[PDB]
Amino acid sequence: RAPSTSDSVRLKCREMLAAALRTGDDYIAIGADEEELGSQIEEAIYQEIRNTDMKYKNRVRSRISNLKDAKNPNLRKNVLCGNIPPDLFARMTAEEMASDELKEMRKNLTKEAIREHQMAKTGGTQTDLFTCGKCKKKNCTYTQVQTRSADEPMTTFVVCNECGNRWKFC
Amino acid sequence: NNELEPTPGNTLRQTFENQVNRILNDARDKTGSSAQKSLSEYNNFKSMVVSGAKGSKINISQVIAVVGQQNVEGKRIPFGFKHRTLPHFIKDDYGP
Amino acid sequence: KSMESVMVKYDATVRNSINQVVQLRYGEDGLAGESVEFQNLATLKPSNKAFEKKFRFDYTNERALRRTLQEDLVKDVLSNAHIQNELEREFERMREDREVLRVIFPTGDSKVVLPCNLLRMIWNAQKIFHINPRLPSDLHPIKVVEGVKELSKKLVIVNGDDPLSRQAQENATLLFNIHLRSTLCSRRMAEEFRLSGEAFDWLLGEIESKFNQAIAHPGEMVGALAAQSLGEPATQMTLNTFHYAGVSAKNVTLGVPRLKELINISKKPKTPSLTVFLLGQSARDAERAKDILCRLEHTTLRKVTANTAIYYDPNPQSTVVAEDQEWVNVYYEMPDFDVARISPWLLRVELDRKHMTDRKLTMEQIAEKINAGFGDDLNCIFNDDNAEKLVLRIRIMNSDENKMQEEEEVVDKMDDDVFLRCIESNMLTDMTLQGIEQISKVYMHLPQTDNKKKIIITEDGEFKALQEWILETDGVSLMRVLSEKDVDPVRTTSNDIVEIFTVLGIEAVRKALERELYHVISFDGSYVNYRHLALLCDTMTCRGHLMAITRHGVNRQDTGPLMKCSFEETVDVLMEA
Amino acid sequence: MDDEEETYRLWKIRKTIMQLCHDRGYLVTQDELDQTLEEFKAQSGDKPSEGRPRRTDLTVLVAHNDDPTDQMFVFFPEEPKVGIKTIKVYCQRMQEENITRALIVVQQGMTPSAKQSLVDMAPKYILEQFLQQELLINITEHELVPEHVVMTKEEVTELLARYKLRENQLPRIQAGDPVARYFGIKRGQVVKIIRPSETAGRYITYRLVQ
Amino acid sequence: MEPDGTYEPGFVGIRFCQECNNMLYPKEDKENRILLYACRNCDYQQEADNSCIYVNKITHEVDELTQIIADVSQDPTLPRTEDHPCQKCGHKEAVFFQSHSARAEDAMRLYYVCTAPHCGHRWTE
Numbered sequence A: 001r002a003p004s005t006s007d008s009v010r011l012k013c014r015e016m017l018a019a020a021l022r023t024g025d026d027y028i029a030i031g032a033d034e035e036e037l038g039s040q041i042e043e044a045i046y047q048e049i050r051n052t053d054m055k056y057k058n059r060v061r062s063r064i065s066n067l068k069d070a071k072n073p074n075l076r077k078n079v080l081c082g083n084i085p086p087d088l089f090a091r092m093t094a095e096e097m098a099s100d101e102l103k104e105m106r107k108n109l110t111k112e113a114i115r116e117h118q119m120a121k122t123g124g125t126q127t128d129l130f131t132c133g134k135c136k137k138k139n140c141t142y143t144q145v146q147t148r149s150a151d152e153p154m155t156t157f158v159v160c161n162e163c164g165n166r167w168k169f170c
Numbered sequence B: 001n002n003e004l005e006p007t008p009g010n011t012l013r014q015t016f017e018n019q020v021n022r023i024l025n026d027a028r029d030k031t032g033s034s035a036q037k038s039l040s041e042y043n044n045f046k047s048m049v050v051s052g053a054k055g056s057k058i059n060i061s062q063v064i065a066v067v068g069q070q071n072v073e074g075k076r077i078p079f080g081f082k083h084r085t086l087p088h089f090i091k092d093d094y095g096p
Numbered sequence C: 001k002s003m004e005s006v007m008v009k010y011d012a013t014v015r016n017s018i019n020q021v022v023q024l025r026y027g028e029d030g031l032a033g034e035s036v037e038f039q040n041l042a043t044l045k046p047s048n049k050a051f052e053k054k055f056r057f058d059y060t061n062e063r064a065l066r067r068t069l070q071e072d073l074v075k076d077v078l079s080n081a082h083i084q085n086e087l088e089r090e091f092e093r094m095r096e097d098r099e100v101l102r103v104i105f106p107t108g109d110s111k112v113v114l115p116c117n118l119l120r121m122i123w124n125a126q127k128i129f130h131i132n133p134r135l136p137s138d139l140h141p142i143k144v145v146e147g148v149k150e151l152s153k154k155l156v157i158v159n160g161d162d163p164l165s166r167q168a169q170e171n172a173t174l175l176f177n178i179h180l181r182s183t184l185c186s187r188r189m190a191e192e193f194r195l196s197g198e199a200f201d202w203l204l205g206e207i208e209s210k211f212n213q214a215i216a217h218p219g220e221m222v223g224a225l226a227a228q229s230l231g232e233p234a235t236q237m238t239l240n241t242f243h244y245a246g247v248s249a250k251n252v253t254l255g256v257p258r259l260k261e262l263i264n265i266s267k268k269p270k271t272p273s274l275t276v277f278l279l280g281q282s283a284r285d286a287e288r289a290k291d292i293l294c295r296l297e298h299t300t301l302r303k304v305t306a307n308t309a310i311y312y313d314p315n316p317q318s319t320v321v322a323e324d325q326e327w328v329n330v331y332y333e334m335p336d337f338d339v340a341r342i343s344p345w346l347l348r349v350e351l352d353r354k355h356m357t358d359r360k361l362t363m364e365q366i367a368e369k370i371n372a373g374f375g376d377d378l379n380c381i382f383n384d385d386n387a388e389k390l391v392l393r394i395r396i397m398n399s400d401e402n403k404m405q406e407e408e409e410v411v412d413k414m415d416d417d418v419f420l421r422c423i424e425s426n427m428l429t430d431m432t433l434q435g436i437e438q439i440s441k442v443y444m445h446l447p448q449t450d451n452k453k454k455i456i457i458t459e460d461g462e463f464k465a466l467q468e469w470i471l472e473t474d475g476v477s478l479m480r481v482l483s484e485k486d487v488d489p490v491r492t493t494s495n496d497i498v499e500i501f502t503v504l505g506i507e508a509v510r511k512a513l514e515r516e517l518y519h520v521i522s523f524d525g526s527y528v529n530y531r532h533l534a535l536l537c538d539t540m541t542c543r544g545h546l547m548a549i550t551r552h553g554v555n556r557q558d559t560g561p562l563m564k565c566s567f568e569e570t571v572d573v574l575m576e577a
Numbered sequence D: 001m002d003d004e005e006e007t008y009r010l011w012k013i014r015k016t017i018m019q020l021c022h023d024r025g026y027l028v029t030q031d032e033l034d035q036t037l038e039e040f041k042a043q044s045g046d047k048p049s050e051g052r053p054r055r056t057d058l059t060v061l062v063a064h065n066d067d068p069t070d071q072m073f074v075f076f077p078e079e080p081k082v083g084i085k086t087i088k089v090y091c092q093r094m095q096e097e098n099i100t101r102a103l104i105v106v107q108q109g110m111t112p113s114a115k116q117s118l119v120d121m122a123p124k125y126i127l128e129q130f131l132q133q134e135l136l137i138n139i140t141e142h143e144l145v146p147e148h149v150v151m152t153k154e155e156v157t158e159l160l161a162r163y164k165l166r167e168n169q170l171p172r173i174q175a176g177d178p179v180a181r182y183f184g185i186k187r188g189q190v191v192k193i194i195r196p197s198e199t200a201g202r203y204i205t206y207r208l209v210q
Numbered sequence E: 001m002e003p004d005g006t007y008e009p010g011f012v013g014i015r016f017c018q019e020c021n022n023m024l025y026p027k028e029d030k031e032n033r034i035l036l037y038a039c040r041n042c043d044y045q046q047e048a049d050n051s052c053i054y055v056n057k058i059t060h061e062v063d064e065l066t067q068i069i070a071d072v073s074q075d076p077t078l079p080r081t082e083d084h085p086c087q088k089c090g091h092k093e094a095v096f097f098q099s100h101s102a103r104a105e106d107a108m109r110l111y112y113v114c115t116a117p118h119c120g121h122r123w124t125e
């Protein structure tokens, strides 16, 4: 039992959602009432927006398109078998609900790679020779600059980044 | 083979150029460290470096062990010619 | 030529030629730069238990011969209640100073320049008096305590019989005074230095004489002296040599080119940046940091777009692109009346799914952003996020009622395709989706496993450091980056100076400018004594507005014409005078 | 906009101006100081966005320095750019209430005639201008900015005397300086700046406003 | 349909005028759903074929086996390879090289050109 509406627009949006659920006739091998469920979906959406706004229409329409996916009928089957209530369906569980293999894996591995673009980032000049005179760690850096010179000859300057300590070969 | 896999904060070209520079610097430093050790106590050269009179460890490295990667403007020798540094080399030779 | 007129005056406040005050005692402390030396501050001692163990003079003394060691005197003073309260008066003050000193040096560095090396002098007392390091002494601790009070009074650098002057005296020797008291504590003398009473007496006389000698001489041309002392290491090392470090370092100009950039008060630095710090979960999680970074990163639609196309399709319900046909099924109810009004010229955009993911942006936010920017005229619709191809479908609408060729259409019959290119030109170049203003395509995501940052205090009292994420950015909009959520509004800083002034105000420039100068000098490895740098920055800010040391900076100063003519502009200034 | 993030902004500028009022010496509740966004969301009822006030009603009175010169008033206009007309109506409200000092926090830009007229009304009654972006944070908590203390005219008299100076000989600070603006201090007055130091450890300086 | 369908709708600049040989521009017929291309200086007009008149940023016209003219193989300063089997002829002697373009882009991928007269065939690896 779901509340009917007297608005022409809401009624039409309901049959469109029912029409979207009728795709592939999956509802048949379950025998569920896709029109009532669609009405509950629409009502549940309405409970959040409470307007006939574009943002409501877009949200319904994006629900519709995601239900119309030919690459993932198993999502629709999951909704049709009542494993996903309409109030849940009202809000996405994923940025373009794609759970049930294929796209979620692809989206996840894509989430791996874009997070991979930060990981090490990039660091370390890299000699790891001398040991620090403060925090006693051997992870250290060296500078080589100005040759010959007059009174401050080319010396090896060693800095411990690890605590900003700086010394020379001395 | 296109299998190098760029470091998270560089392009593929920059990663390669960073990586060879890391290895060739690492090479000079190992052979450099090796000669300072192989030297004895009587080497007057060690007496001038150690007192702090003139020169440095890297100076010792350069006369006896190996001079290493020359540089200009902060990177390896430029391709003065089309895809070569001197006419003597093959085109697009990124070796040492 | 800028500093030359600055010198110590006989009341000791350093002033320039027109007699304006630069500092109230030279280099903030009255001490000349010839006789100061590096010293360690014992008192930054890590654990609270070790500090209490080391410094507190014991009263719970062992019932055994306990105390006849080190001193033969304590048999005399084991019973005095007053001596117990007075030492407790000393230790609580030390523990209070200890708290003040942590605020002074947030970096937990214990190396400071001071006059009169107290360890070496104390070591000098043991040497001369021939004090056995393992015998009982005749020294009295109250003598030390009162002697140290007496010695502090003796160490006056400027007279103070006045409460303001008395306060100016107390803070202007604070760092030396805590150093003195923490080193010359009763337990320190007793447990470690073993000095005798006359030995202590000589030690007071020595610290007294060398400290008084150390003070700066009024008359010194400290302005001239400071300018050459900074000038000299600038001659040394690195025209423009590069130092490979982390991901960054196409960053901050190094050396003399940075000295010129900084000192000129450049409106257009060669490499402006902000070091942004993060808070909450965002200070320890990579993905959270990714989210804040995304909001910050100035991305424009052009950066995001994979492809564009323009198509001739008057009626969607017969689309020239047969594959688009399903969105028409999808979008028949999308304002169904004005499909009779939309122009037959079509714009189509294709978006990359990986790149769109990295910005974590949604298609509806873009449609709403572009719709809001251009207005209701620019009619936008978009696709299902789960499609393998990402597409944005754009037409252009009008105001319906008013467009009936009233006169000749106030557009001058501009071609509509061509106007659609102008929409595409501007739509890409202008649209600042999520990212707001100019920090450019360039961000850096750094782990500070590097330097001396993100350190705090702990229940142990020690300066356990954190390792946390920070964001280096090539950018200038310091003001907005502070305003954003999860960005630490305390530590976030810039290498730029003109922007620091606008946002934070003249005192913050004095600090940041000293830090930036300090930073170039440390890189080049050579050390410059702090007084000299403080004096330069103070000379530059005194007027209120930043005084670049160039003819458009220092030659606007209300100094006399005859000085200003010998600088650069010469004839023009004499003509103007 | 029409989003909760806006509330956070309104909340955050409210926190900053309250700290500013507090730092000028005015009496304010510590509970107001501690008031979080979730508390605010109920305590002012920032509704669900669209409805009424989150501004005109956010408008607040503050009245507490220890010396009873009586109230200060803080106003948050609605429109993106405020015209002289709204300032004038506001002026009528402050006059009829007989306010002592007004702080105006504007949404975006400023009419140049409004700034001018704001300048010209100053000798009669005194009047401040802040852009909202400058109040989205609290600059006084930044790691670079030292402790500023406004001095009372008498304490300055004692300062010039004890050093034997003249006001002109002092170091200077712009009137239009962000910290000067933040205290809302007027031209001619002196501000005492206290700094951490690498040698004395603590160094005290003074600045004349001009 | 499929995402495998190549992206070449016909960029197309020239098919200029047939009479005075100047450039054609699109222009509308609201009456017949037809695009027309007209010379601006004459009355000549003709319908367009594709509704496409402009695209930008294929972002990947990788240009890997195009423009690279086969005569490149005669160049003595390019590295000959003993690496065998041109993919067309049963003969080794491929000449190879990086990028050779300022969009260098960042490519490190080798391009191989067979050098014996039986091919001229080129291919990436």
Ligand SMILES: [Mg+2]
Pocket (backbone or CB within 6 Å): A149, A150, A151
């Ligand atoms: Mg010499």
Ligand SMILES: [Zn+2]
Pocket (backbone or CB within 6 Å): A132, A133, A134, A135, A136, A137, A160, A161, A162, A163, A164, A165
């Ligand atoms: Zn270290």
Ligand SMILES: [Zn+2]
Pocket (backbone or CB within 6 Å): E017, E018, E019, E020, E021, E022, E039, E040, E041, E042, E044
């Ligand atoms: Zn023609």
Ligand SMILES: [Zn+2]
Pocket (backbone or CB within 6 Å): E086, E087, E088, E089, E090, E091, E114, E115, E116, E118, E119, E120, E121
């Ligand atoms: Zn072949």
